[model samples]
Target: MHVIKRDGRQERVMFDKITSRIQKLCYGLNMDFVDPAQITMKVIQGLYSGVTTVELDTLAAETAATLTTKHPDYAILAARIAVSNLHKETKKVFSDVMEDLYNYINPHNGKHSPMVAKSTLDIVLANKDRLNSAIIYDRDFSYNYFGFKTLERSYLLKINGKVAERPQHMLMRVSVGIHKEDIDAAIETYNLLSERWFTHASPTLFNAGTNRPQLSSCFLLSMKDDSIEGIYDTLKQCALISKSAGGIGVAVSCIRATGSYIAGTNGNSNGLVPMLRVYNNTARYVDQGGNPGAFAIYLEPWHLDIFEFLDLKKNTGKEEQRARDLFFALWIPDLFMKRVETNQDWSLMCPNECPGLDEVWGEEFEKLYASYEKQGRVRKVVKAQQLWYAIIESQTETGTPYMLYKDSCNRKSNQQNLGTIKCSNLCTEIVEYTSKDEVAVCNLASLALNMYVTSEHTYDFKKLAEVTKVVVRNLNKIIDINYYPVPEACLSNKRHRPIGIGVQGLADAFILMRYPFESAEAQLLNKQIFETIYYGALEASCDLAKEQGPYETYEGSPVSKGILQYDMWNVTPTDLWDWKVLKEKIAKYGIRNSLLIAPMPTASTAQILGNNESIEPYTSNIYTRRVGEFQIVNPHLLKDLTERGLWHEEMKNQIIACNGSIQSIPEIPDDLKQLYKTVWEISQKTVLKMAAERGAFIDQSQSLNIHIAEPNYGKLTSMHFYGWKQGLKTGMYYLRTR
Candidate 1:
């Protein structure tokens, strides 16, 4: 059979040639489990006449990845094959690729279509030899097959449907974009990032050094007005933000409800349902740079349209009623939870009838709401438990309507002086005040927790502190350099200067240290690690403030008053670091950023780095990996089982049969089972406890997900009440169920 080479030459399909190629890629893979002959045979089955060398390499990689269940080392080999193939297909020199992107013209239009920014091109051209020699092309081999595929799919710059920038080039571009003319700092950022200590958010990675560099990830928007003009005006902002690949969280609780009189039109209003439908359609229409534009809609529970609001994100609903494209969240007030606990009547009112209901919180809010109820302005009255049940029901069916405590978020926020904080960002970790004039923005990066694990199996708090300082400084620099999508976002970002320093691989650290999910040892380390991260970030921000002066809104804030995050929670931290000295410095110099240390969900970034998501336990010991569509065992479990000679074909099947749980497997050691328990297997109370323990140090919030198997009203109720009683800002981000 004849096959096509990359150079367009036709050659006979030689089995020996394929085997030799596979053999060369298998230099360091474990021969006991991973075999080049095995990959070659599988590749042969996938080959067809006129198959290109590119297709041949892909088949080989997929074949090897399919064997990850057999050996973890196979994953490494698959990455090597895929990366080697990519190296062959792309330019090795970074400067040449930059020039290619800088001087490209559209094929059909015959006009200039430069992919690289003019400024970025100028910098590269001025230091062509230095930049070219600085980049380590072989480091492209570091990304696993799945990670490299993710980068190739959306991250790498494409010219006319073809990828132009290599992974190293993209990293260098991001570093240079943030550092500008600071070449030494740019190289430092590039090395740290390329070494996988941390990664910037997706928007930064996607548009860095591009012409329109809208690099901030999250945007919090308040509705501009209550009329048609206001609704669409706010929507236009959302669209503009989305077009630049920014995720939006918007609060629409202020809009008048259905049957309310419209002053301008002299008619009854159609309420949030219809207005949200328009926003939903926009979300579907204006995707964030080819990815679907994501918007999370936040509302308080007191609107007269409460019941309908709960049903918006449900799947089985009317085309008009279901805005399933948009995410829904409840900005729950304590009054609602109090009434639910006491089983009292709950009043729902339109924002028109209730002027200050959505505007206030705590005792002042309670007084206003009670007087409104006495004044007979309540639109409808129902049992408070009724609405509470509806929220739990929606979450049961839809796994959404993420629950966030409005009062807790406001009372504990450093941005409290700014105004009543409107709504959290899309993921619920960010809690910043968003007025109509100023939209809140947060730049994010997550530390690789497993990287700090020492060879002695001890957690390195000092090294963690050092890396965190680097992350804080870089994120602070990013704020000054970031190209915000909207004027409001830039205004808020510059004034408040907030950054989210999250972490991934908490579960990996636990397993490496041989601690079970619920063990006291794991819990201690969890608290201390977060405490260290928070301290490191505060010190860095304070150092920057000493040089650059305090952020515009830093005065009268919690930290500026010599009170830290732990002070807000009323919990005293252990003597790991000198908190007294840090407070003294902060009291003198203030802080460059108003708030920091938000543990966001590291969903995509975690996969690229091969770690668990932010501050989360392992969801399963065995799960289906998207790569090659295979059911793979946990890498740690596989290694441990293999080293002990307990790993076999039947053992792998037994694991799949058990649905990723190893507790019932008698042959597996009890200690291994305990160490590898999935989130579903672990008690959620323990999870919440760990969250609360770390919550004292975290100034923002954690994207805390509660995993329950076969959730019912009783179980779900117990879990939420426990989380709320434990004093969490974000009680639940999502309820993942079996």
Candidate 2:
């Protein structure tokens, strides 16, 4: 059988060459756990006569990736094989790759079509000497199989559908794009990214260095006005942002409810359902350049159509009522919770009839709403607990309508002075203020918490602080260079300059420190770690303020008054971080950024780094995905204990038998058990405290997920009460009830 090479050469298929290629990728991998011959045999079985070398590499990579359950090292080998194949196919030098992307001559004209912009090319050509060598090609191998493959699938740039740029090349392009004239800072950013200290948010990685580098991650928009013209204009805005691959959150609480009077046509309103159906279609139609674009729609319970808004995302709903493509969230007010707790009647009203309900919040909102009811403006009235139960029911059914407090979000906001901040962004982690005149935007990046672990198993708070400062500077720079899809986004971003700095691998950090999830030491470390990030981020923002002046509208804000997030929440921080000195500097120079330190849910980024998600403990020790092909507990933990004669296949089976939990295993010691307790094993009350402790330093909020195996209303009620009483801005990102 003949095989086709990527360069168009055809030759008889050689088993030896395929085996040799796979074997070379197995340098540091265990030969006993993986055999090149075994993978090659599968490759041969799947091959056709005219199969290309690229196809063979993909087949072999898939073969090895499938074998990851057998031994985790197979994943490394798989990544190596795939990466090696690309290395052979692409140029090693960074400039060469950029030139190829830039100078892809039009076929008929035989001249550069300029897929890349001329200014960027001019910069690259001028600095090719330094820029070419600034990137280390060897760092490409650091990515594991799944992570690299995800990049190859869509993250990396391609020319004519073939990947033309390497990961290092892309990183260099992003860096140069951000720090155009500042080559030193660009090189620093590139090196940090290549070393995997942290990564830019997905949108930044996707668009930086391109002509219109729209790098900001998420955007928040609200109704321009309660009219047909206003609704369509808002829809157009959402459409434009999604085309650039941005996540959106919109507040629909202002729209009039069903059967409400419309002064324009003298017709009753069709309500938010019909309006959101159009939005659902837009989300589907203009989704992130054909990738799924997320639109999280938020509504307040006081709106007369609250029940229908919750049902929009439910799968069992009538087809016309469901807008499944759009995400739903509650921009909840504090009074609703009080009513639910006290089992009192709740009144729902149309925004058109009750004008100030969506505008006012806290005690003022209750008084205004009560006055409206006294004036008989109520459209419907029901027991607040009944509505509470409905929200709980929808959560049980659809896993969403994310719950966030209206009063807490507004009262704790640095942007409180900006206006009644309407709604949060696509991810609940972001709690920035939004208005009709401005679309709030945030740039995001999460630090690898485990990377700061020392060789001696000590946590490195110093290094954590240093890396966080760098991230602060990078994200701050991003605000200037970012391509905003909408002018309002630019207007808000330039004025407020919000950025989210989150973390991945908190669980890994805990286990490495020999501290359990709920241990006092772990809790202290959690608070101190955030305290350090907040301190470092604030210090850097202040320095930037010295250089660039404070962000627009910095005065009359919470931080300007010496009230930090912890102070707003009434939580006292420990003295490990020097808050007084930072406060003094801030008072003098002000801060360049408005919001900092939002702990986002690092979904793919976490998986890419092989770490647990942000500040979350492992849901299971040996859950579905394996290190190699065989089912196993934490492989690093297993390796360490195996060296100490505690881990074997039986222990592996024992852990698996106990359903990915190790606390019940007799062979594991109390120390090991404490260090490795799953999130299920740890008390949720402790998790809430940790979130609050870390939250004190988090100026924004966190995507704190709640996991209940059997979530009856009682359990969820107590949890929400616990979360709010602790003064959390976000009640929960999602409910995971098994």
Candidate 3:
């Protein structure tokens, strides 16, 4: 019963060497429903008497990722047995894993804590053998065990607490931390991020090549003049862009409310709920790389604490009017949905007695909020469906405050000629153009609609219109190479170049083209995959405006007047491409990127590409994942019921006592129980009618999250007036539940 191994030999419990190392990582998997001696006979019935060998290779890659619903090549042999147990525990060159993360030391405070960044470890030890033979460690088995455990939990590159880098050394350390001293544009951005075609956000893959690269992923910000040194100098620029991980939005509809009137210590304006509980306790004490610090804030339904700002994320509120970890929105004002569709009378002013209600929105914010409610200078009135039924009862008890509009995000902005564009960032699919000396910044990537699905189940729309023209020439070369922690975010990202391009596994490309997640051939392949990604990102921003020409604020914009974004959501696009030949090539070359395809919320790159998150579904089929002290399943419904012979151990305790759902089990079948139903067994009004059938090829919107297991306020006001009468510029972003 011995064990121990990794060179400190003691090997006794062999069990055919754990079924011959999971049958040599089941080369090119799918052995008639992934067997590897039936995951080494359930890893020898959960082995013990000294199991080591890295806990038998994490119990054979969590039993081959719980047999990924029987074939997606058993989640690629459970990510090649967790990348062959971290390639037998690390270091196979790539300059010896960036010289062990730049000679790290710490082991509980021994100091020299490097984690790669003394100038990206002196440019990878000055090109150590062409970056260690341009690393191709089999492209880290092209990730799949939940996107290689989401780059080995929170994107590889840890030092003292473990990981040390190796998913091709974190894509050649984010292509030499975004091509510094261009080694051929850092091996063409590390072979387009190891050929997954795109990816960047997650604080530019966790501080690209370390030592704070601050890579940029939407910032916005504004309120820097409502006093107290303009609200703690816009909260020290939202804690220096949330300590280099950045996500904020900000705005604060020009601050002044709750017993207003404080001209420099004239005292009496503790408005925006004690100044947003000090920007919600500095977004829970600025922790971004160490994760959780995403922000939101916005505000502008004529302020007088607009019903205590929709009761700041209610849950039986009153903890200083609840900030509930910051993320409330509503730059709304389409005259508050036209006074909640004419129930009328809704004043509520106090941006210090309504001065420029957030400096005017459309129709000059309805003639300065109806001439400050006919000069009565309102402080409160009511009945715009009573603040639209307290924002549909705080989105049926806290799904969120996010709703956007502000006269259709500044009347369909091309940075609406730059002003009055207040908010939208913490993933309301970013709008842009912030002020008081510019702030906005974006730089994100997505496109893995189940890798363009093909093999005749059709949907290679000319390879998603040539990989969205190489992710719009690699996000316009990351807006002339990012790294701006603030020079007003490199002057609003070099005058609005904006680039998001989202799409992670649209429900694994509609269950690998077998369709279903509310079919009609998966809502016409989700509006022909965003009309071939908005006509291949407007023919690669009209060939980068015929080699660098537009976007320094392209005049009277909306794509310089031929009007695109499904013609400002009046909606038409279904001929799939040939939008009059990309509007006669963007009306003779004029589109080098002033916003292009936002989509976002691909929650951590759709869990590192195991997909099914953004444009969601399959919410369960035995969910629980945790890995280490075991709590697994959902390996695609345990390899589709162990390839019909139906899996055992009381069918894994009847799918862990039916919580991970399989629609009341009963020996599965019925077309594998309607392809493993789980977004709470389908029909979120067929997911907002498939997000308004891919909201006419999405221009700058769609984080669109809205799952409901029991929500109310009449089904969340009939799914936010069916995604705001289906024009949808991010009609909803979060609202998930068990």
Candidate 4:
């Protein structure tokens, strides 16, 4: 049989050549454990005539990746092979890629549709050579195979159906996109990012350096008013944001409830359900850049339509009543919790009659709510536990209708000085003040957690502090140069200057340090890491304040009044950094940004980096990966078993039979079994406790996702109340199914 060569020449399928290529890529890999020839021989057996060179590279990469369990170095080699193949296929110079993207014509329309912005393209053209040469192409190899694939799949700019931009090209594009006329700062940003110090959020990565650069991730909108114009106007905002790939969180507390009087129409209102159906359809129709629309709708528990609102997200509800496409959340008032605690009757009222309910918080809200009850304006009365049980039931079945304490969110918010702080963003980490005139926006980036691991296995607070400074500076630049989709978004972003700096692959970092996933050591490390991030972020923001002054609304903020996030949480931090010194600096100069350090769920970005998503653990060790005709074992697990002389076809079948779980496998050691335990296998209490432990340093919040194989109201209620009592800004983001 003849195989197609790189030059398109048909040649005898040389097994030796395949072995040599595998060996070449295996240069620094552990040769003793990873047998390149063995992998090559298997690859040769699978090869057929007319197999292209690209196919061969894929085969080699997959082969090496499958052996990662033998040694982690194999995973590195696999990534190298994949990255090398991409490098060979794409342009090396940054300018050439930009030029292609700039001059791109849409094949469908035959019109000159440039991918890069006109201004950004002009900047690149002015300094083509210097900019091109400044980008170190070798740095592309720094990303692991999975991370590279994530960039290739989602972040990188593509031509037609194939990837056209390299990792360096994407980084340079993002830099120039954010630093428009400032080539020097662009180059500096490019170098730091390409070196893998940190990365911006997916929306920024996808839209930046493109024609329409809507780089902000989270957008929070408060209901304008309880009217048709208001609801449809808010709907328009959601559509516009989703069209540009922005995740949205909208507060619907002010909307009139079912059977409540509508003054304009002089009829009973349909409440949030029908309005939400319109939103549900909008979310379904507006798939952002080939991604699912991410949205969450929030309502306070005191709404008269609370039962119907809870049923909106239920899987088995009347078709017209359910808005299943949209995510639901409870902006729970403290009074509701108090009523539930006291086992008393709870009254739900319509916002049309009870004005200012959504506009006030704390004592004002409690007094107004109680006064309304005393005045007998209640539309409905129910046992507090009944609504509570409904919420629990919805969560247990759907793993959603996320719970966030209204009082806790507003009570501790620095933005409380601005207003009641209506809603959180799509991920629930962003707690910002939004008004009819302003739509709150946040630019995001995540620190590579594994990079802070020092040679001594101790966390490197110094390196983390240094990188955080760089991240702060970059995110600040993003605010100045970002392409705002709407006037309100631009207004809010510029004035607030909020940036979200999060972490990806916390599980990978823990595993690298040889700490078990849920071990006490891993838990402490999680806390300390976030502490260092917050402290460093505050320090850097203070320095920025020295240069640029604090954000426009920084006056009267919690930090401005000597209250850090930890202080609000009433939790003390570990003595990794001098908190006293940082607080002094902040008190003197103030903080440049309004809010900092929100730990987002790094789903897309983490996949590209080959790291575990955010602060999550491995879900399964023996997960199935589909090939042309067969489902293959997860290469990492395969390699490990092979080295121990336990890998065989029968062993593979056994893992598949066990549904990607190795705990049932008798031969696997107990330590290995525990180390690879999935999220479902580990106690979710560990996850919640870990989030609370790290909540002290998280100034904004964390995209805390709770996983339970089979959830119940009792279990979910306990978890939510625990996080609320612990004073987490975000009680939970999303609930995952088993």
Candidate 5:
């Protein structure tokens, strides 16, 4: 058999060469646990005539990854092999790749098509020496096998359908993309990103420095009006935003409910279901880059069509009645929960029939709602528990109708002075105010919390604070550099200037600190981490405001009055951060951004960074990939077990049998068992409590998902009530069920 080389020369397949190649990648891995010869033999068995050397490298990497349960070092070897293979294919220097991207010619039309923006290319050309030397190519190999694959698949810039930029090159491009002419800032950002200290949101990575630099992640829009022109106009906005890879949360509370008056045609309305069906199709049609469109429709529970709205995402619903592609969320008020608890009657009204209902919140909303009932404008009255049960039923069946408390969101918002905040953004993390003329936009980035865990097994808060300040500067820069899909978005973004700074690996950090997820130590660490982030972000923004002046709408906001997020929560922060001094500084010179520290669900970015999803406990310690080829065990658990000489084939099998829980394993120590418990094993009350504890520091909101192993009505009800009573803006992002 012959093998095709990278340069297209055929060479007779040699077993020793393959063995040596695998051996080279296996350096630093535990040789006692990983057998390069075994991997070589498997690659030989799978080989075919004329197989390329690239394919052989991939086969070796996959072989090593499949043996991850035996030792975590195999995953490292797999990553090294993959990274080396990519290094052989892609460009090495940053300027060369940027030039290639900037001066591209389309093969189809033979016209000039620049991938990297011209301004970015000009800056790169002007600072090639320093920028190129700033990158450390060795950092590429640090990514785990899955994380590297995620970057290769989704992030790396492609030219003519092949990856042209290395991982380091992409980081440099993203840095330069955000910081255009500021070479020093770009290099600093590049070093932090390449080191995995933090990562910008997916949209930033995908489009930053590219022709379309729409770097913002989340967009919140208020429905223009209830007319046909209003509906289609908002649809167009969603399409444009989705085309540029922005997730949307649009408030449809003002759109007249079912059978409400419509003067345009002198006819009654068909209501939200039909309108949402059009949006559902639009969502599916206008994809977010390559991914499907994600639009979360938010409705107040007091709407007359609230019952039907709950059924929209259900599996058993009629095809015509369903808009399954669009996600559903309830913009709940405290009154609904109160009525449900008291088992009192709930009045539902149409926004057209009861005008101005969607325009108010807190006491004003309560009084207006009660006055509407008194004025006989109610469409129907039912037991509040009835609507509550329906919400639970939908959540039980569909795992959604994401719950966000309207009063809590509006009352606690720093943007409350602008207007009554209608809805949260796609992840339920951004609680910015949206209006008919203004579309709320939030640029996002997340810190790798595990990176802050020092080799001495202590968290480096000083380093975290420094990196967070850098992230704040970068995200604040994004508001100006970003390409707004809609003019309203651009207007509102500049005026309010909100940014979401979140984290990825809280679970990993807890593991590094030897604290269980529910333990007091872990809980305290969680609060302290967020506290430091909040303080650092506030200080950074305040510093920026001192230079650039406060955001356009900053004067009337809560922070302008020194009413910070924790103050609204009626909670006292630990002395981990000096809130008193920061509040004093903020009172004198208002912050640049209105909202900060929204803990978004870092789903894709977390995978790229090789960390657990945002603030979430490990769902499983072992994951079985398709075709039974890969069984990825959690690295921390595997490392601890291997150190104790307790990891063996039987222990691996026992973990798989226990469904990723080590609690029932006999040989595992009690401390290890406590440390490695999955989300299923941990009490969810602890999860809610952690969310609430950190919520004090979160200026915006969090994508707080509730995981229930086996959910029932009573359990779901109690959980939602607990979160609502806790004064959380976002009660839940998604109801995750095992």
Candidate 6:
């Protein structure tokens, strides 16, 4: 049978030729278990006349990935085949690929539509040898099957509809885009990215080298005013940021409550539900290069329409009242939790009638709110536990209304010098000050923590610190080079220069060291790892400050006053990296960025690196996604079982039947079971306690998700109280329920 080639040439499809190609890529895999001929048989069974050789290779790879449960080596062979096929279809040299991308024109319209920026093209051409030789094409084979497929589908740059850039090519393009004229820095960033030590966030990957180049990941905005002009103005800003692929959090707390007077219109306001519903459709209308926009609407629990806000995301809510497409969060104050604990009355007020509640925080907010109640401006008063139950009920049903303690967020914030921080970013990890004139932005990068584990079962703190510094410098560079969608975003970003340094594969690191998720050793390693990152990030920022001076608003910041994140947390750190020396340096030079060490939800970048999502324990040993439609076992678990001679088809069947848990499989050793325990198996108490311990080092908040198979009011109540009492800013991202 003849098959179409990638270049439109027809060739006779030889069966043995396909078998030989598969066999060639089978090197270093388990020959006894992964048979190249067997995969060829499946490929031949699916082949048809006029099929493309590219399609044949994809079929072979998917066939091998489907049989990954048979042996883990099949995955490596699958990746090699897929990557090899891609290498054949694309250009070999980085500079040549950029030349094609930079000169591309819209075929349909016959107009210039260059993907790469003119400046980026010139810089790469001038330093072609340095950039070209720096890339290792073999690193493409390092990705697991799913990871490579993820890159092919999303991260890699495309010319028209087809992928034109390889993984290494994309890495080089991003590196150059970030550090334009600095060829040495670009090459250094390239190596680290290709080696899988760390990765920038999705928007940075998608738009970095492009002409627009909007690279920041998260944007936080506040309502401009309580009028139609203000509301629509904020909506336009969200749409623009969404168009550029930035996740958004807008504080709608100052919007006048339902039935409140609107002096301009001389009518009652429709409240957050209708306004948020408009935002919901806006999120739908604005696609970030195909992905839908994410907007989290933040309101204080003391709002007059708090109950309606809680019900907006529920499945049973009325259609007109529901804004299910938008996410909901509570900018909660500590007084609400205390009132709930004591079964006291909580007054809810309309913002227009009782102004300034959202403007103040800590004791000042409490006094203004209490004064409003005493002045008879309260629209309603109910038992605080009543509102608390409504919140729990909504969370149990919808897994939302993300809880962020207003008092803790303000008290622990380094940006408190600016103003009362309104709300966190979309993921809840970023707590920045968003005002009418400014939209806070954060450039993000996540370290693959598992890569730091050595073969001798030791955690390499030195290498982690080194990588952390590189990440710090890279993200700092991004703030100056980023293409801001709106002027407000640019103003805030340049003024503060905040960068989020997060991590992936904390669970992988623990497993490599053979520590249980909640073991004392694991807990200690967790704290020390964050401590090192914080220390390294601060050192890097200080060095940058010495060169470029501090961020514009650094004079009144906490670091300027010698109060670091740990100092604010009231927790003492271990003598891991001479924090004393770092503190003294910071005291002298100040720090470049206003805040650092925000552990965000590393969902996309973590996938590219084939690591578990940010600081999270494995949810299951077996995982699958909507794409690929293939089930695979965890590589670490598979290796452990095979070496112990306990892995077989029956073992795979047992683990699958048990819903991806091996705790009760009987033959697996207790230590292995402990090492493989999922988030559900471990006590969430330890999870929160660990979050608090690491919180001492984290300047911004973390996206901590609480797992409960079957949640209830009592269980939810206890967890919320514990997290709040422990002084967490983002108490929960999502109430992950079964």
RMSD for each of the candidates: 2.2, 3.3, 23.7, 2.8, 1.7, 1.9
Better of 2 and 5 by TM-score: 5
Assess candidate 5 and give its TM-score to the true structure.
0.97
Reference-based lDDT, residue 453, model 5: 83
What candidate 5 gets wrong by more than 4 Å, as runs, is 7-16, 27-32, 288-291, 624-629
Cα error of candidate 1 at position 337, Å: 1.4
lDDT of 5 by residue, 602-650 (tens): 9778877778889887889987443235778888998788777898787
Can you give the TM-score per candidate against the true fold?
Answer: 0.95, 0.92, 0.36, 0.93, 0.97, 0.97
Candidates ranked by TM-score, best first?
5, 6, 1, 4, 2, 3
Candidate 2 per-residue lDDT, tens place, 405-460, comes to 88887878788787776688888878787767788887898877777778797878
Native-referenced Cα lDDT, model 3: 0.74
Residue-by-residue lDDT tens digits, candidate 6, 423-487: 88898999888988899898898888899888899888988888888999999989988999999
Better of 1 and 2 by TM-score: 1
Q: By summed lDDT, which 10 consecutive residues of candidate 2 come out lowest?
A: 624-633
How accurate locally, in lDDT, is each candidate?
Answer: 0.82, 0.80, 0.74, 0.78, 0.86, 0.87
Tens-place lDDT digits, model 4, residues 1-738: 677776888777787777777677666554766677777777888888668887888988877776655555666677788878888888777778888887888989899988888878888888997998998887776665555666777677789878888888888888888888888878887877887767788878877766767788878889877777877888888789888877898899889888887666688888887878888889889986564786788888898877887777677768756777788887876778777767798988888788878888877788999989899988889999888888877777776677777787777666777888777888778778888878878779977787677668777778788788878888888887777877888888788888888888777687667677798888878878888788788888899999998998998888888888878778788887788988888898998888887888887777666666787777655542332322333434554565677766667677766656788888987766666666777768778788878877776667878877767767776777777766666777677765
Better of 4 and 5 by lDDT: 5
Of the two candidates 1 and 5, the one with more favorable lDDT, higher being better, is 5
- For model 4, the local distance difference test gives 0.78
Q: What is the overall TM-score of model 2 with all chains considered together?
A: 0.92
Candidate 5 backbone collisions, by pair = none
What total of clashing residue pairs does each candidate reach? 0, 12, 8, 8, 0, 0
True-vs-predicted CA distance for residue 520, candidate 2, Å: 2.1
